[PDB]
Amino acid sequence: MNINDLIREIKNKDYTVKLSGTDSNSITQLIIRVNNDGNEYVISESENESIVEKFISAFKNGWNQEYEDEEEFYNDMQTITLKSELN
Numbered sequence: 403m404n405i406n407d408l409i410r411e412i413k414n415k416d417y418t419v420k421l422s423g424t425d426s427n428s429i430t431q432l433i434i435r436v437n438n439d440g441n442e443y444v445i446s447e448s449e450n451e452s453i454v455e456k457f458i459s460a461f462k463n464g465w466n467q468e469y470e471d472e473e474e475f476y477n478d479m480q481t482i483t484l485k486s487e488l489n
């Protein structure tokens with residue numbers, strides 16, 4: 403999908419996310435807010451990684467001791483990475 407698709411897909415789940423601009427030529431940046439309580443996750447795409455692959459990899463190992471009260475978000479987080487690979 404396109405960076406814009408991320409906004410549209412995130413909008414459906416009512417999540418706050420943002421994308422860069424000229425970063426498209428090289429690598430775009432995706433910022434996902436895990437919790438409005440100030441809890442947020444930072445991820446980016448590199449020629450060796452992508453937001454979906456990098457972001458998914460960060461949570462690929464599954465919910466960490468980070469915060470159980472935020473585990474539900476992480477379970478849902480995988481949906482975003484699933485959306486990217488959506489043709």
